[PDB]
Amino acid sequence: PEKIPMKPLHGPLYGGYFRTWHDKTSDPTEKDKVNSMGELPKEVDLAFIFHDWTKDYSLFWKELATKHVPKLNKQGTRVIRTIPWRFLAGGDNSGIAEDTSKYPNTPEGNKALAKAIVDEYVYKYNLDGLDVDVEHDSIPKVDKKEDTAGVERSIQVFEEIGKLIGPKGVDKSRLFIMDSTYMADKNPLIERGAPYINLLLVQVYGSQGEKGGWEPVSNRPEKTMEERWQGYSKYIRPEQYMIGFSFYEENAQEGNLWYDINSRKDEDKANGINTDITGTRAERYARWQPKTGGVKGGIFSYAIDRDGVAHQPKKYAKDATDNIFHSDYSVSKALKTVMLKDKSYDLIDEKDFPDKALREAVMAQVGTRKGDLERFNGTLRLDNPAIQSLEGLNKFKKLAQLDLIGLSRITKLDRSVLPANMKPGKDTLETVLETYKEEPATIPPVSLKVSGLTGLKELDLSGFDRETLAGLDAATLTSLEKVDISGNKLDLAPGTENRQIFDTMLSTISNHVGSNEQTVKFDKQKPTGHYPDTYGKTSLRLPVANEKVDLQSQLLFGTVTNQGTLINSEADYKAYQNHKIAGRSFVDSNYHYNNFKVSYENYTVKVTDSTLGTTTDKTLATDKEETYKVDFFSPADKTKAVHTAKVIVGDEKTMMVNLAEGATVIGGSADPVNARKVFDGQLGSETDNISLGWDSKQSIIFKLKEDGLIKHWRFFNDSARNPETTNKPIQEASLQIFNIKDYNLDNLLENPNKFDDEKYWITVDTYSAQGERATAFSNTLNNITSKYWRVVFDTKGDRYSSPVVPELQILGYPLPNADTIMKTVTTAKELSQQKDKFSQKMLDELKIKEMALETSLNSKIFDVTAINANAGVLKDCIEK
Ligand SMILES: [Ca+2]
Numbered sequence: 088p089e090k091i092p093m094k095p096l097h098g099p100l101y102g103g104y105f106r107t108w109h110d111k112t113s114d115p116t117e118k119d120k121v122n123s124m125g126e127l128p129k130e131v132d133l134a135f136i137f138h139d140w141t142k143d144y145s146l147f148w149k150e151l152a153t154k155h156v157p158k159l160n161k162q163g164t165r166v167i168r169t170i171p172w173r174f175l176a177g178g179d180n181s182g183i184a185e186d187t188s189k190y191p192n193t194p195e196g197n198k199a200l201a202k203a204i205v206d207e208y209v210y211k212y213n214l215d216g217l218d219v220d221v222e223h224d225s226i227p228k229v230d231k232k233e234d235t236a237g238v239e240r241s242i243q244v245f246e247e248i249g250k251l252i253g254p255k256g257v258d259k260s261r262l263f264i265m266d267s268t269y270m271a272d273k274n275p276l277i278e279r280g281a282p283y284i285n286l287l288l289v290q291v292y293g294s295q296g297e298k299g300g301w302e303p304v305s306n307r308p309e310k311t312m313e314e315r316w317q318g319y320s321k322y323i324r325p326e327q328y329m330i331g332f333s334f335y336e337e338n339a340q341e342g343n344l345w346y347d348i349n350s351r352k353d354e355d356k357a358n359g360i361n362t363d364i365t366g367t368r369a370e371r372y373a374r375w376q377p378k379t380g381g382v383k384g385g386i387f388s389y390a391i392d393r394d395g396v397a398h399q400p401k402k403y404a405k406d407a408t409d410n411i412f413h414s415d416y417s418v419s420k421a422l423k424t425v426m427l428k429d430k431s432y433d434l435i436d437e438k439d440f441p442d443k444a445l446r447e448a449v450m451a452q453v454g455t456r457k458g459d460l461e462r463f464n465g466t467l468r469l470d471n472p473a474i475q476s477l478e479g480l481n482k483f484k485k486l487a488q489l490d491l492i493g494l495s496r497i498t499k500l501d502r503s504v505l506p507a508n509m510k511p512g513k514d515t516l517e518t519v520l521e522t523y524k525e526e527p528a529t530i531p532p533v534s535l536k537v538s539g540l541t542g543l544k545e546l547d548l549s550g551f552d553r554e555t556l557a558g559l560d561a562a563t564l565t566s567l568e569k570v571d572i573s574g575n576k577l578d579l580a581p582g583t584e585n586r587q588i589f590d591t592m593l594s595t596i597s598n599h600v601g602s603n604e605q606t607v608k609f610d611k612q613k614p615t616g617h618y619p620d621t622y623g624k625t626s627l628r629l630p631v632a633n634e635k636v637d638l639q640s641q642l643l644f645g646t647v648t649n650q651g652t653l654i655n656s657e658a659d660y661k662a663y664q665n666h667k668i669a670g671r672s673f674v675d676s677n678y679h680y681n682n683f684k685v686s687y688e689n690y691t692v693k694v695t696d697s698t699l700g701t702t703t704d705k706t707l708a709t710d711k712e713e714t715y716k717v718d719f720f721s722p723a724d725k726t727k728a729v730h731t732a733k734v735i736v737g738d739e740k741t742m743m744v745n746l747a748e749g750a751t752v753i754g755g756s757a758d759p760v761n762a763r764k765v766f767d768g769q770l771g772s773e774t775d776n777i778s779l780g781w782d783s784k785q786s787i788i789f790k791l792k793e794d795g796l797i798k799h800w801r802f803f804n805d806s807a808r809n810p811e812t813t814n815k816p817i818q819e820a821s822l823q824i825f826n827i828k829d830y831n832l833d834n835l836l837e838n839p840n841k842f843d844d845e846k847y848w849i850t851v852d853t854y855s856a857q858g859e860r861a862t863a864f865s866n867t868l869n870n871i872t873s874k875y876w877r878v879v880f881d882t883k884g885d886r887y888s889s890p891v892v893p894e895l896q897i898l899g900y901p902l903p904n905a906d907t908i909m910k911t912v913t914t915a916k917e918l919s920q921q922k923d924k925f926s927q928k929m930l931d932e933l934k935i936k937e938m939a940l941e942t943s944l945n946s947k948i949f950d951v952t953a954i955n956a957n958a959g960v961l962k963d964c965i966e967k
Contacts, residue, residue: 088153090213091160096262098326099426102133102288102387103419104169108142109392109411112150121413122392125155128416129162130423133286133387135169135218140180152212165215167264168208172220172276175204175244176227176237183207192240201247209252209261216262216285217252219245221269221276242279249283256283264288266331270310271318281322288387289315292333293345297368297520308523316377325381325462326454332369332386334393334418337409344404348418351397351408359407361397362417364425369418373425374519378528379485381459382431386422394418431458440479444471449479460484461516464531469494477504484508484515486533493539498566500540501547506533509551539563546592549608550574554615555649557584561591568600571608578614579673580666583650589668602669609668613678616646616685618721619653622730629709631737636707638694639687642732643719646684654683691725693718697740698799698898700865712737741949746795747876747897754788754839755877756780762787765895770808777808778889783815784881785890788839790874791897794905796944797871799898800852802880805891807862814891816861818883820854822897824873835875848877868899870944872906900949908954911962912940918965936961 105124107113113120127134136151138144156166170182177184177192183203184190190200209217227237249255253263266288271277281287291297291312299311316328332347347368349361364370372386388394394414399406426432435455440446448471453463460482467483470492477497480489483506491497502509513527532553537543538560546567553575570592577585589609596602624642645655654660660680665672694702695716707715715734720727750766752759757779764777765787771777779785800822805812825835826849835842842848851871854864876897880890902908915937919930940957943950 100132100385103391113147169218172225175241218264221267333389335398442476444473499545573608578648578650714740743898755786757785797899801865801896819881823848823877825875
């Protein structure tokens, strides 16, 4: 039949999914189906056809096209064909797209598929639009496997369909609709599909759709109703957004029980009808509006053939409501009535914006509903010079950006003609949804840009707590005769951008009517205190004394304004407090240093000494001569330093390096793979098996990587990695170097585990645990130069008390030929004890060159060049 013309879509809308297998004409076999899709009331704006694609129902499609559609159109109801996502791709159950012959994955093939799709599902029965179901159940598949190529192809075709129908199509009278279960960032079709659709329908069935899901790990609601909208707010307009609940489907199973309408009473066994809307999730969905952006397009219901049917009680999730009922659609009519009482959908009129040019701009850029003014958080640009009055701007509650451009007829700017969110504030919009507990979100103040207002005589921005004056093109405000920027948070110190803008306005005013206390106001400012991006004090030299030092207060300090003004101390702020403009300060009298300064109270430190020993104490004792590296951390990020400084107590000592990191395990009675983990440079993961062996006494024979002079060593207990360790700490320990003087190195390498015995080695230090808890042990070493080492750990407990050592550090400074340098300095000592062989005068000259080398070897500032020189002087002196 010929298509009855219908008025353009105008929300708030009600949609409904009518399942085809519940229309009388669908299956003549049964008679329990007493419902008809043509019986849907005028209250329904969108009648969706949800079909069982395995069924034929040829009698239904005829009834639909010839009787249902004319009846529904005449009352103003549109009929939309719902097709699966996979119908746009190919593969399993893809309908038309199964025939790859006529519709290949080509540009012209996709273009042909799009035409065939609208031909078959839209125009064939003269329907009012196409609805694409995009969810997991409708995903493109090939042999039951999800197909990326299919999904990617379905992004096209969709674009091609959109060129035929929808707001960007040839036939705009046909709607193009996407319904989905996905979030925007999980919907691969929304980004390129959104410009082609009229409406986006989100399925939010059940309490999980309403409240969102409770995420276990975070102790916080995820995927909430507001988050879902916010995700799609990037792609569509609020008026295109429709949320959905579900009626009770007969014989519904677990996973399909939503309870979006009132359940059956646990005693009323003979009744399956409950047309009451009171307390339902559907009634709450009808009244729900987004907090930002604007008012929604409306709501929709699934299984609208089950309208009026009570839900099966939750107690029976493993009935009278499972019978088939003849619906009169009371619930649908009731919900549409609720949405029509929503005053949010009242049109923005001349009362809101008396100026026609302004009213037009708002209607184009924001919306047409009064409730959009409460929610719009985008950008309103006013660059139409015709605008004579800004009356109505105060109606904006959440506006993000306002551009006043070239409006040369405006003579005054104040709070009465500016957005209500000029000053800070919280969300006042009430919530209608159930929650798991609603903390009022912070409404960001509107960013204001004013340029070209050449007729502006008064500018009043007082008492808005404005953070900055950025946006004011003061040079263009040539008619200014009065200004008031007092009572904000502006930093008006000289050299700042805020000051530049103010001075320009001041100059204009002085020339016009003269600058006085009634034409120029700027005081009572409370500038915000911020953390500096960088810190200047990277070095601190302290004398050796019996004093404790607060590292934070001496290295990590300072508060900066958003204009760049850095205040490092109360003295700096006092100098800031008497910055004068026209003889008086701009800073509020009650805004003191403690009110302005940021707090470093919860910052943490990491102090590393020259032996690479670490502490986390913010207080440093200067009773010992030591050089430190100090890292500072913010509470927000404990693994990333906001500032690094060097602290030198007494004479500076060069920072040592772990010469044992990356060493090679050669032997020793220990797990060779875990033994390598004491040299990896980390404490390891708590979950990692790091035990050296089974016996309580394990040993490790290893080789260093770089020639160096060893001056220290350190090993950690398991408690350094895990404070709650059950592993027994190391009781006895020995650090050893190879006895290369009395034994052959070659024998050691060819068979290492034969030399896993003390006699082949020389103990250079011994550790005996005192008893108290200790995360590590460290000790000094007297200039050791051995490439090959041996270490023995022992917990001295029972067996199965494995020696657990997260790291072994052998510290010192890099020095090539260190082994040889110590040879010639050792020979110098040997010859000095041969007093029967050389004269005292020959020895005294030698001792000078000997004590010259030792001084450079033990020099606090480690000089490799000087060491080489003093070693060369000595070696030539020993020859002969
Ligand atoms: Ca380790």
